[PDB]
Design an enzyme around this catalytic site. Structure first.
Site, mmCIF file in Angstrom:
data_model
loop_
_atom_site.group_PDB
_atom_site.id
_atom_site.type_symbol
_atom_site.label_atom_id
_atom_site.label_comp_id
_atom_site.label_asym_id
_atom_site.label_seq_id
_atom_site.Cartn_x
_atom_site.Cartn_y
_atom_site.Cartn_z
ATOM 1 N N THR A 159 105.182 54.627 45.685
ATOM 2 C CA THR A 159 105.592 53.834 46.838
ATOM 3 C C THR A 159 104.913 54.208 48.154
ATOM 4 O O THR A 159 104.274 53.364 48.794
ATOM 5 C CB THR A 159 107.108 53.866 46.995
ATOM 6 O OG1 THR A 159 107.654 53.305 45.802
ATOM 7 C CG2 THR A 159 107.534 52.997 48.138
ATOM 8 N N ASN A 180 104.404 60.770 46.729
ATOM 9 C CA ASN A 180 105.741 60.732 47.318
ATOM 10 C C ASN A 180 106.216 62.166 47.629
ATOM 11 O O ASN A 180 107.075 62.359 48.477
ATOM 12 C CB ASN A 180 106.697 60.065 46.336
ATOM 13 C CG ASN A 180 106.607 58.537 46.344
ATOM 14 O OD1 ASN A 180 106.059 57.913 47.262
ATOM 15 N ND2 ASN A 180 107.158 57.927 45.289
ATOM 16 N N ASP A 261 112.303 47.428 42.456
ATOM 17 C CA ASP A 261 112.028 48.797 42.021
ATOM 18 C C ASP A 261 113.329 49.529 41.646
ATOM 19 O O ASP A 261 113.412 50.180 40.619
ATOM 20 C CB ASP A 261 111.295 49.556 43.144
ATOM 21 C CG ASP A 261 111.013 51.008 42.810
ATOM 22 O OD1 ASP A 261 111.797 51.896 43.185
ATOM 23 O OD2 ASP A 261 109.945 51.300 42.254
ATOM 24 N N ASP A 308 104.037 46.709 46.315
ATOM 25 C CA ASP A 308 103.331 47.970 46.396
ATOM 26 C C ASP A 308 102.760 48.431 45.045
ATOM 27 O O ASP A 308 101.720 49.083 45.028
ATOM 28 C CB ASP A 308 104.186 49.039 47.038
ATOM 29 C CG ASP A 308 105.537 49.244 46.346
ATOM 30 O OD1 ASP A 308 105.879 48.504 45.394
ATOM 31 O OD2 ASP A 308 106.236 50.196 46.803
ATOM 32 N N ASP A 683 77.375 64.021 44.438
ATOM 33 C CA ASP A 683 78.583 64.138 45.264
ATOM 34 C C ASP A 683 79.277 65.446 44.978
ATOM 35 O O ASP A 683 80.421 65.500 44.471
ATOM 36 C CB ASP A 683 79.500 62.950 45.017
ATOM 37 C CG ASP A 683 80.639 62.867 46.057
ATOM 38 O OD1 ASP A 683 80.479 63.445 47.139
ATOM 39 O OD2 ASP A 683 81.659 62.198 45.755
ATOM 40 N N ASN A 685 80.543 67.498 47.037
ATOM 41 C CA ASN A 685 81.771 67.770 47.819
ATOM 42 C C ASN A 685 82.882 66.744 47.577
ATOM 43 O O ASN A 685 83.859 66.671 48.337
ATOM 44 C CB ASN A 685 81.453 67.954 49.322
ATOM 45 C CG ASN A 685 80.848 66.724 49.935
ATOM 46 O OD1 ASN A 685 80.578 65.746 49.250
ATOM 47 N ND2 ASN A 685 80.654 66.748 51.249
ATOM 48 N N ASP A 687 83.522 63.656 48.160
ATOM 49 C CA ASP A 687 84.084 62.823 49.265
ATOM 50 C C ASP A 687 83.785 61.345 49.068
ATOM 51 O O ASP A 687 84.140 60.516 49.917
ATOM 52 C CB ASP A 687 83.628 63.304 50.649
ATOM 53 C CG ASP A 687 82.114 63.219 50.873
ATOM 54 O OD1 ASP A 687 81.305 62.821 50.003
ATOM 55 O OD2 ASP A 687 81.706 63.540 52.015
#
Ligand SMILES: *[C@@H]1O[C@H](CO)[C@@H](O[C@@H]2O[C@H](CO)[C@@H](O[C@@H]3O[C@H](CO[C@H]4O[C@H](CO)[C@@H](O)[C@H](O[C@H]5O[C@H](CO)[C@@H](O)[C@H](O)[C@@H]5O[C@H]5O[C@H](CO)[C@@H](O)[C@H](O)[C@@H]5O)[C@@H]4O)[C@@H](O)[C@H](O[C@H]4O[C@H](CO)[C@@H](O)[C@H](O)[C@@H]4O[C@H]4O[C@H](CO)[C@@H](O)[C@H](O)[C@@H]4O)[C@@H]3O)[C@H](O)[C@H]2NC(C)=O)[C@H](O)[C@H]1NC(C)=O
Ligand code: XK5
Ligand code: CA
Ligand code: CA
Ligand code: NA
Ligand code: NA
Ligand code: ZN
EC number: 3.1.4.39
Length: 805
Positions: A159, A180, A261, A308, A683, A685, A687
């Site tokens: 959520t 969460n 939900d 969501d 890549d 690192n 990111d």
């Protein structure tokens, strides 16, 4: 401390937040335990319920009532939503035929169509079809407005990560809400859904829509609702704010529902108990639309109905326990459930070792229902690694399952039948999008898209400039009637060199050999023409990729492929080639098995060498354009050029060779030819962005040849597969991948088997958007097509998911 002795008289659901210890009257005061003493009495009236009835029509105003049915109520902006229907003979909005909203039809004094975002927690995409008979108002929004068959959430499909992604346009690794539940080691603080740490502003990165709006002079309703405020009161508050004077009235609003939900967890996504929560949400939508119609706003407001994440069947008995795998389970902390995150229980424990935890969790049980990953090895499409709040060890849990640390965790916490959080490509996790209003299109279906794209569109709907985010602005222009965003293509930063033949064979000392010493005027001119680009139209179908950073590179032409060769990384940035439906696969001839050939267009100083591979006992090499797909025995020599070679672990070569020998031809057969662009990605690192040369952590032993962390391919063909890839008049179709370049195949539990049983499954897991590859390479693809640029942006955001219907 709160001085709860102040009063909410004339302050009910006030928009400006007042600071402690002064008491609050806003829609979140309950969550902070800070409401004034008379908030319930004044602001949460319930007397006589939420609906007008025949006997209430024209009543004398009684300020005690929850809503009103007196003659003055329309001018007060506080009628029950069904007032005009019960008392003035009007129809409910849902019963009116739908009629295109060609222009906003707004009352005087409205500067712009307001936006109302109606968010529903846990609303699984398939509820739109499966529940359509019990959701007439939602069905009208969907059929009359613009809708997607589904909308893809971000990972994890929880959520708070998703609601904050909706608000910001950012991946969770960038906005900071990565679950969460979270632990931040720098703050040494824990984030939980219950309690007060979550209100501290240090958790929340990026810039959410209500802040973007306010900064740019567009007033926002307060988006957040305390759980105990009834939905009917939320709707009435929004409708009341819409009746404020022009100078005070917000232009953007949110409603949130905790359903479906809440029931979904208890009953499963399709439990028979789920019908009632769906009917109730539809009734709330009805209240809003009737209320807008009463205000003459139902052909003025843009409404977004959005979820969501979805909901999957999950029960206690489908739980894997780490105590069945690990000897040292008391030395770890697990964040459990539909994903797992592991770290050391104590930072003072120098016996803690992630390598041994990963090994103990890898392919240990035949039907094991989770897979462990160091976070940098997770599929790059999840964009789930670049945040210190994301533990190094991640467990990707199979749909329908949980992971927990010990059995006592699961019964000293069966109750639940639904959960969510899994991989965001899983069908049960998909959610909903509908847009209805003057700015949205009429009766229009759009293809599925990701929720990271919506912030930009919400900004477009309000005339706002979005803060920097992970959407691709313009990729959702096809949802909109007007207010489109018309971006320009980025400017190429580095222009290529086009080298001719500049070096003699004997200038090279690379330790390579090739049996190519076997020897025609007719055909000699022909080979020269291929080297000058005479076949480039066949193999480079959408223009050369643009290089969007400063570097030195060469375009190299061949009969069967074209490449952009980096003098800094000593290998192609990209290699482009077309394989028709009729192409034939061949073998690498015996005399060429170990053949590597100097490229006389490229200096020895800017070339790889074979000695480095000989000396590096762990590292081998492969080719970007596959020798197996050479157009002729003669053209095949080009595939063995040192400028087509890339470093590959032997374990990875099993994957790559099967892709090149078997799968490419398979796709050309099925798609009526394909164009392929392949290359390396660095890549180190993690990111999600192209490494500079000083970020590279591994080189082929003894050399300056950098080792890729990943290899990509972009596979493009004609959406109308009756036309060959190389003669396509209309829209394109794409699928892509970003394969991790790993020295073992531990990720694939079936890898001792023939590649036909595991390689394609691996590739599906590592499916990617072209846009993901753009970020990771600093390249910009599809520069020269006949297609609109927005259409191309949509194509670059496509993800081929490999999920059924
Ligand atoms: C998805 O979209 C987003 C948004 O566009 C993309 O993220 C951006 O990417 C940029 C490059 O990684 C990055 O630019 C950097 O900004 C630094 C300043 O950052 C602060 O200010 C901004 C603006 O208000 C703010 O948004 C930032 O917010 C981050 O940090 C806070 C905590 O302070 C969090 O609450 C928030 O959630 C967010 O965290 C995320 O980003 C950071 C990185 O910034 C990560 O570490 C987190 O894990 C998390 O993912 C900040 O408050 C600026 O300092 C940087 O400049 C350095 O690098 C340049 C290179 O040009 C160099 O020249 C400079 O010298 C400098 O280096 C110095 O510091 C180094 C490290 O300490 C040191 O080693 C050197 O020696 C130097 O001293 C840099 O320009 C931008 O911040 C983010 N924005 C956001 C919101 O995340 C993202 O890339 C997209 N993703 C994909 C896959 O495309
Ligand atoms: O009302 C909420 N109650 C439950 C916790 C909660 C609520 N909202 C407000 C509704 O926002 C959604 C998503 C953004 C666009 C508008 O609709 C939140 C917003 C972000 C986060 Cl991270 C948690 C939220
Ligand atoms: Ca949710
Ligand atoms: Ca990087
Ligand atoms: Na080797
Ligand atoms: Na394996
Ligand atoms: Zn939930």
């Amino acid at each position: 401390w709160t001085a709860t002795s102040g009063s909410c008289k004339g302050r009910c659901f006030e928009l400006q937040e007042v600071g402690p210890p002064d008491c609050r009257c806003d829609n979140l005061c309950k969550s902070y335990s800070s409401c004034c003493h008379d908030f319930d009495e004044l602001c949460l009236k319930t007397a006589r319920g939420w609906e007008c009835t025949k006997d209430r029509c024209g009543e004398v105003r009684n300020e005690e009532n929850a809503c009103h049915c007196s003659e003055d109520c329309l001018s007060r902006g506080d009628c029950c939503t069904n007032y005009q229907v019960v008392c003035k003979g009007e129809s409910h909005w849902v019963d009116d035929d739908c009629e295109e909203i060609k222009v906003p039809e707004c009352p005087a004094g409205f500067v712009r169509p307001p936006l109302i975002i109606f968010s529903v927690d846990g609303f699984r995409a398939s509820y739109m079809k499966k529940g359509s008979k019990v959701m007439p108002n939602i069905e009208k929004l969907r059929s009359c407005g613009t809708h997607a068959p589904y909308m893809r959430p971000v990972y994890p499909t929880k959520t708070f990560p998703n609601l904050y992604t909706l608000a910001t346009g950012l991946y969770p690794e960038s906005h900071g809400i990565v679950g969460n539940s979270m632990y931040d080691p720098v703050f040494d603080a824990s984030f939980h859904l219950r309690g007060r740490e979550k209100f501290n502003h240090r958790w929340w990165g990026g810039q959410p829509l209500w802040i973007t709006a306010t900064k740019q002079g567009v007033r926002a309703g307060t988006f957040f609702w305390s759980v105990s405020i009834p939905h009917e009161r939320r709707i009435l508050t929004i409708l009341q704010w819409l009746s404020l004077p022009d100078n005070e009235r917000p232009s953007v609003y949110a409603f949130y529902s905790e359903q479906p939900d809440f029931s979904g967890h208890k009953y499963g996504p399709f439990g028979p108990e789920m019908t009632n929560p769906l009917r109730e949400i539809d009734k709330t939508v009805g209240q809003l639309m009737d209320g807008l119609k009463q205000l003459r706003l139902h052909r003025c407001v843009n409404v977004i109905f959005v979820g969501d994440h979805g909901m999957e069947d999950v029960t206690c008995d489908r739980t894997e326990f780490l105590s069945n795998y690990l000897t040292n389970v008391d030395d770890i902390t697990l964040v459990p459930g539909t994903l797992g995150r592991i770290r050391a229980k104590s930072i003072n424990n120098s016996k803690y070792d992630p390598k041994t935890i990963i090994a103990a969790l890898t392919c240990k049980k035949p039907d094991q229902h989770f897979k462990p990953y160091m976070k940098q090895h997770l599929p790059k499409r999840l964009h789930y690694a670049n945040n210190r709040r994301i533990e190094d060890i991640h467990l990707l849990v199979d749909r329908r399952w949980h992971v927990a640390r010990k059995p006592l965790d699961v019964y000293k916490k069966c109750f639940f039948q639904g959960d969510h959080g899994f991989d965001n490509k899983v069908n049960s996790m998909q959610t909903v999008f509908v847009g209805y209003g003057p700015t949205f299109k009429y009766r229009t279906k759009v293809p599925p898209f990701e929720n990271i794209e919506l912030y930009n569109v919400m900004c477009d709907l309000l005339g706002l400039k979005p803060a920097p985010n992970n959407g691709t602005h313009g990729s959702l222009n096809h949802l909109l009637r007007t207010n489109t965003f018309r971006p320009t293509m980025p400017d190429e930063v580095s222009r290529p060199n086009y080298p001719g033949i500049m070096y003699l064979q004997s200038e090279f000392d690379l330790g390579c050999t090739c049996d190519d010493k076997v020897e025609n005027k007719l055909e000699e001119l022909n080979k020269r023409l291929h080297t000058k680009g005479s076949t480039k139209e066949r193999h480079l179908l959408y223009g050369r990729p643009a290089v969007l950073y400063r570097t030195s590179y060469d375009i190299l032409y061949h009969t069967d492929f074209e490449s952009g060769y980096s003098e800094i990384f000593l290998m192609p940035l990209w290699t482009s080639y077309t394989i028709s439906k009729q192409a034939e696969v061949s073998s690498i001839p015996e005399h060429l098995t170990n053949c590597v050939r100097p490229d006389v267009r490229v200096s020895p100083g800017f070339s790889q060498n074979c000695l480095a591979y000989k000396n590096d006992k762990q590292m081998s090499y492969g080719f970007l354009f596959p020798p197996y797909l050479s157009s002729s025995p003669e053209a095949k020599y080009d595939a063995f050029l040192v400028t087509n070679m890339v470093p590959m672990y032997p374990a990875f070569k099993r994957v790559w060779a099967y892709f090149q020998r078997v799968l490419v031809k398979k796709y050309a057969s099925e798609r009526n030819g394909v164009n392929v662009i392949s290359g390396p990605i660095f890549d180190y690192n993690y990111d999600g962005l192209r490494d500079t040369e000083d970020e590279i952590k591994q080189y082929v032993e003894g050399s300056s040849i950098p080792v890729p962390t990943h290899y990509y391919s972009i596979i493009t063909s004609c959406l109308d597969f009756t036309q060959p890839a190389d003669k396509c008049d209309g829209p394109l179709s794409v699928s892509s991948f970003i394969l991790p370049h790993r020295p073992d195949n531990d990720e694939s539990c079936n890898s001792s088997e023939d590649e036909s049983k595991w390689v394609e499954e691996l590739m599906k897991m590592h499916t990617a958007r072209v846009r993901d590859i753009e970020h990771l390479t600093g390249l910009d693809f599809y520069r020269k097509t006949s297609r609109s640029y927005s259409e191309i942006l949509t194509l670059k955001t496509y993800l081929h998911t490999y999920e059924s219907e």
